């Protein structure tokens, strides 16, 4: 009864998003110039969407066929299901943004008030947020119902052996497939799309300074529009897909841990083997993350509703944070009752790591929540010019360009410590409360209100497009200032959301490492003590070698992406010169850059997906565990570094735009130094960091799936 | 046998004789003498300042190390400190004395040969000092505290008055290693802060109203930077290679010592040692003899090169020295390994897969591993190859393009040498377990004397060319010195890469030694697989890994900021002096500021294991060590390769290879910006990480005996 009521929440969120979509669609359109700019934007965005979707479908079909040949067929079906859910969320969000980009500015001009434009923008972003949440949890509920309970995969819970000889718990491999689908979608989006985005931005500045002499924010400059399209591609599709991958990864990790926890804690008392953790407890913990995520999504919808109906205010950041805090607190309170009432009558929780009984995992989840917000604040502390580091960078701008670059690198390097220490304490306490299951539950709670987080993240690029459109149409300077204010708010929210995404990616990747270690269980370890099975020895030279290899592969991944951005930008500059030699060609250059980025992403994608396969069939599962540990560590550090450095450089340029630095204004030599630094930092913050967030999770997912094969089938 | 124990002081006397020989070489013109006198003054002043601070810290640490643990540990700590400081001081004095003699040979003879011989002998002083002093201290420890006091005879878990348990000889060699590490940390961290502050401030004053050319004797930072070159590529790199050398040897010794209490079997009421005392002592002594043979072969190669008929190709001569030393070590250590371990029993329980010859197969691997790693450092930094060419050519696309391509180059460059390290570790393990991993580190550093000599050759020739041009010598002679300088540049890139690789190997060996030192007297009956274990599913280990990585990155950033601050302070001091040249004044101001800055990175590196272990335990410290090593290796390789690539791309455009642009052109301006960014990265961050990844491991190895059972949570 109540269970089915919770299972309706996904369609509730889908209908909420659809209704908000329709409501905004009804909002007034802009002037003919506004409409022409929006039409260019929409054309480029939809074209990019279709272009990437083709390759996505191809790769998804190949991977689904492979997942059906090996493992089970339900694995590939759930893979395709998750792929479809994530692709649907992204497409819906991007179409909504391309339709509301001008409506925000129309509210700002017609009403001459911040309130209405803010509410329109928040509904626009809430479309993508509710889509990312709803499609994901809907597919996951379907998986737990169709392939889960109906087919008795939650009933068997034994080591199923397929025709090839690959061993696995059926539901574990199923949820692994559902996660890998979302991961393929997110990888394509973030990696390739981001290469495109930063190619567009860079080439925009370039053609601004090329022989064509067409500065950025120029309607004639095709990259001016392409960059807007890329901004939506990134902070609406990319960031949404990343948060979806982390969310689904946390849930799937919890489910996998419980599923494999059923065969692990067994005791060969005599000739027979008793399950110390009964089936009831295993099923309860397989379902608890799903119910927790549903309650979180409901609370997120409640917060979104309050903010969209709340009396208008003057601080937009305040309203967005109000949404965040309402969702967080409601999730905390309701999930407390969920935890205590759903796990009370279970047995074996002590053997599991639950230190305070049925309520132990909730203590974990709330921790993650706070961890999340804390990490967010850190991303704001090291990037905003309201605080000391960015102020110091902007001030040192007077001392040269090399000093700007060095101080930005120093800031990025030092910025990794506060959030990483936050992660350290969060992991320690979540473990203390409820073992690795609670580590996963802390990852989940951190993302328990993912809908509002994605909505606030997607609000940013909407305001960016709004300010760009307004400036290009030369509206009233008052309206331009309104858009500037909203743009600044969106920039702050984007920094906070990117930091939150990095933290969530680290948590999810660690949860997936734990799921890998748990999935290494074989039918021959039934009598062995649990300490013998759940083990990755760091003295084994294979593990150290794998760790070094994983770190190096992460760094090489980052470097290749850096080079790819510049190559795509140079090719787009050549295309723009050709267009000048022969209303410019918007979709033409956008499709050229999109195809080049999708062709370039092939090699980083092949790295991310095949590194565990190659290294595992070559040396085994300890080596792959080492690779995962090194990848997670180096990717966490590099992502934090690049994101914070790029944000600091950009916000220091903005600091100088206001002239705060010793009266210096636009055009001064320090401003040129900061601009050079910002051109350096753009690909780091918008291409490298998110792709590392994706890497550290997708490699773990592929390892979790394929270890069932190469654990015993390895050459050396 | 005794001859092997004599080899260290043989190398010391070889270095003294080379010192005397070069000192007798002609000085030169009065201007040469004045500039060189400024150099010598600054060098001795910096040496004295750092030596004073070193003495203070060393006395404190020795008292602390004697109060806890044992007294011999602190005694060996001071011994190693003294050995490394002696090596550094001797090498720096020799280099500052031979800098002008090289140019005098080049001018009087108008030939490359004699100047090259003078410079190489000067560097061989520092190399032979590092080798002789290190192996001398180790022989003294193995003889006095080793056999005489019977510390190699008991080989059982001694418990001190406080209750701290450990094998005595392991703790003693750990103390000696910590002493070498304190010296190397002071050298690298503080000296490098000073060097890059000086190099930056020289460029800075270049653009003031004072109109102080970067190569002008009036510019004090010119001289400070000339001195800093010796501070860095003679003292810093020498101390780093010495630390890695001693660390590999000590790791082998610790593993061997702790393998005796590990492989015991409670067959009945008694405990039988599956690995007998004879085998354990033989494996405790084998690394020492291996290193002695390596130092002997290094001396032979140095002698061959210094007596060889003079030639015109310097790079060929240096590579000849390296290869002769390598091959001689290979063959002689082959015979040593086969004859010294043949009649030992229980090698199979230790990991020796092919019997007595197993560790040699490991050692040679390290050797090869070494040279290969070197090549990679040259491939990604020299403009003779594709990456640096691409960077220099892309200079035309802007300054941001230069910076982005340099970062990309470093990031991608970290992969070939790390894969080399991966394969080397895998094969060394296949041959002889973690003991052979340590033996591979040793073989990689088996000819450390020759490596340090080639590394110290560079700065000697750099200062020599500076002296020549600054004194306006014959343009032909100046061009000759410039050529020698270029050879030194390539060798310096290769040596920095080799040092990073050796630091990684030594840090991994020290991690293995830490895990072995975690043994307690209560785990004597437990199977060996249960004790020698660091589970990565333990959340404390993962948390420690994240913490160590973050601490590494914060370390790097703090060093960058300290370099910039010290450079600005030196510029302020030079302005004050102009308003009211000051060579030793500004040099001492920068030295004191760098020594004040080093306090926080040193406190990080030394106190992180103590705090985290007394707080959370030994698994957390193992995690911290793993994360520190993994992140430091990557960051060191990245920063070093990026700085080298930027510098050689600037050289590419200055060399006009990219036709259409000369000095002053916009692409050259971009390359100069890139080089100013890369200087602190390659000359301060990378080496300091090399030190960090080892010294944190050593402090952990020592203090785990306390905080393994004394931790709050
Ligand atoms: Mg723009
Ligand atoms: Mg804009
Ligand atoms: Mg930009
Ligand atoms: Mg941005």
Radius of gyration of chain A: 25 Å
Strand ordering within the main sheet of chain A: 1-2
Oligomerization category of the chains in this entry = homodimer
Task: Count helical runs of chain A.
Answer: 22
N-to-C span of chain A: 54 Å
Major sheet of chain A: size, sense and barrel closure?
A: 2 strands, antiparallel
Count of separate structural domains of chain A: 1
Helix proportion range of chain A? over 70%
**Helix/sheet category of chain A:** mainly alpha
Which ligands are bound?
magnesium ion
* Shape summary of chain A: globular
Strand-and-helix sequence of chain A, N→C?
A: HHHHHEEHHEEHHHHHHHHHHHHHHH
DSSP strand count of chain A: 4
Strand content of chain A: under 5%
Largest interface: A-B, 75 and 75 residues
PDB class: membrane protein
Keywords: Membrane bound pyrophosphatase, membrane protein, complex
Assembly: dimeric
Entry title: Time-resolved structure of K+-dependent Na+-PPase from Thermotoga maritima 300-seconds post reaction initiation with Na+
3D structure, described in words:
- 2 copies of one chain form a homodimer.
- With 716 residues, chain A is an all-alpha fold.
- In chain A, 82% of the residues lie in helices and 1% in strands.
- Chain A has one domain (1-716).
- Chain A has helices at 2-26, 32-69, 73-110, 114-150, 153-156, 170-209, 222-264, 279-309, 316-342, 349-352, 360-381, 388-396, 401-415, 417-446, 450-472, 477-519, 530-533, 541-581, 586-600, 602-619, 621-657, 669-710; strands at residues 160-161, 167-168, 266-267, 274-275.
- In chain A, the strands form 2 sheets. Chain A has a two-stranded antiparallel sheet. In chain A, strands 3-4 form a two-stranded antiparallel ribbon.
- In chain A, strand 1 (160-161) and strand 2 (167-168) form a beta hairpin.
- The longest helix of chain A is centred in the middle third of the chain and has 43 residues, at 222-264.
- Chain A is globular and about 85 Å long.
- At the A-B interface, helix 13, helix 14, helix 16, helix 18 and helix 21 of A face helix 13, helix 14, helix 16, helix 18 and helix 21 of B.
- Bound molecules: magnesium ion (4 copies).
- Chain A: Residues 71-72, 153-167, 261-283, 343-357, 430-435, 520-540, 620, 713-716 are periplasmic.
């Amino acid at each position: 009864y109540v269970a089915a009521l919770f299972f309706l929440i996904p369609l509730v969120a889908l209908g909420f998003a659809a209704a908000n979509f329709a409501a905004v669609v009804r909002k007034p359109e802009g002037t003919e110039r506004m409409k022409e700019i929006s039409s260019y934007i929409r054309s480029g965005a939809d074209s990019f969407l279709a272009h990437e979707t083709k390759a996505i479908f191809k790769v998804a079909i190949v991977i689904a066929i492979l997942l059906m040949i090996f493992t089970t067929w339900q694995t590939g079906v759930a893979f395709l299901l998750g792929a479809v859910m994530s692709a649907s969320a992204g497409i819906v969000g991007m179409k909504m943004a391309t339709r509301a980009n001008v409506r925000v500015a129309e509210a700002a001009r017609t009403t001459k008030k911040i309130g209405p434009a803010l509410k329109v923008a928040y509904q626009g972003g809430s479309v993508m947020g509710l889509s990312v949440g709803g499609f994901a949890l809907l597919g996951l509920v379907l998986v737990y119902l169709i392939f889960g309970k109906w087919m008795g995969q939650v009933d068997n819970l034994n080591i199923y052996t397929n025709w090839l000889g690959i061993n696995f718990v059926p539901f574990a491999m199923t949820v692994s497939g559902y996660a890998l689908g979302c991961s393929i979608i997110a990888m394509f989006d973030r990696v390739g799309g981001g290469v495109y985005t930063k190619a567009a931005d860079m080439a925009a500045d370039l053609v601004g300074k090329t022989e064509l002499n067409l500065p950025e924010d120029d309607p004639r400059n095709p990259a001016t529009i392409a960059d807007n399209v890329g901004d939506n591609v990134g902070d609406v599709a990319g960031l949404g897909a990343d948060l979806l991958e982390s969310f689904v990864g946390a849930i799937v990790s919890s489910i996998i841990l419980a599923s494999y926890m059923f065969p692990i804690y067994v005791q060969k008392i005599g000739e027979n083997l008793v399950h110390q953790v009964p089936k009831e407890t295993i099923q309860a913990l397989i379902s608890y993350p799903i119910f927790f995520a549903l309650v979180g999504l409901g609370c997120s919808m409640l917060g979104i509703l309050y903010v969209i109906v709340k009396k208008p205010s003057d601080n937009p950041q305040r309203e967005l944070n109000i949404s965040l805090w309402t969702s967080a607190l409601l999730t905390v309170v309701l999930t407390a009752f969920l935890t205590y009432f759903y796990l009370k009558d279970l047995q074996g929780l002590d053997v599991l790591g639950f230190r305070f009984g049925a309520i132990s995992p909730w203590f974990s989840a709330i921790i993650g929540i706070f961890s999340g917000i804390l990490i967010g604040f850190w991303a704001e502390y090291y990037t905003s010019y309201r605080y000391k580091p960015t102020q110091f960078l902007g001030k040192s701008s007077i001392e040269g360009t090399g000093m700007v670059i060095s101080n930005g690198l120093s800031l990025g390097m030092k910025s990794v410590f506060p959030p990483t220490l936050t992660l350290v304490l969060g992991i320690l306490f979540a473990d203390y409360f409820a073992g690795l299951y609670g580590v996963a539950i802390a990852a989940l709670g951190m993302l328990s209100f993912v809908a509002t987080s994605v909505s606030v993240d997607s609000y940013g690029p909407i305001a960016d497009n709004a300010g760009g459109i307004s400036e290009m149409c030369e509206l009233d300077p008052e309206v331009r200032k309104i858009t500037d204010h909203l743009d600044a708010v969106g920039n702050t929210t984007a920094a906070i959301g990117k930091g939150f995404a990095i933290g969530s990616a680290i948590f999810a990747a660690l949860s997936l490492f734990a799921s890998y270690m748990f999935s290494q269980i074989s039918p021959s370890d039934i009598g062995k003590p649990p300490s013998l099975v759940l083990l990755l020895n760091m003295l084994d030279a294979r593990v150290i070698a794998g760790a070094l290899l994983g770190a190096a592969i992460t760094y090489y991944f980052s470097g290749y992406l850096i080079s790819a951005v510049t190559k795509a930008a140079m090719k787009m500059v050549d295309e723009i010169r050709r267009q000048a030699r022969e209303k410019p060609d918007y979709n033409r250059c956008i499709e050229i850059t999109s195809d080049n980025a999708l062709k370039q992403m092939g090699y980083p994608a092949f790295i991310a997906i095949l590194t565990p396969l190659v290294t595992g069939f070559l040396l085994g599962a300890e080596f792959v565990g080492g690779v995962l540990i090194g990848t997670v560590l180096s990717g966490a550090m590099l992502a934090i570094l690049t994101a914070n450095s790029g944000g600091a450089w950009d916000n220091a340029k903005k600091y100088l735009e206001a002239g705060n630095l010793e009266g210096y204004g636009k055009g001064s030599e320090p401003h040129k130094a900061l601009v050079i630094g910002d051109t350096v930092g753009d690909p780091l913050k918008d291409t490298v960091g998110p792709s590392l967030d994706i890497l550290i999770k997708i490699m773990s997912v592929v390892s979790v799936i394929a270890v069932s094969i190469f654990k015993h089938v390895h050459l050396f």
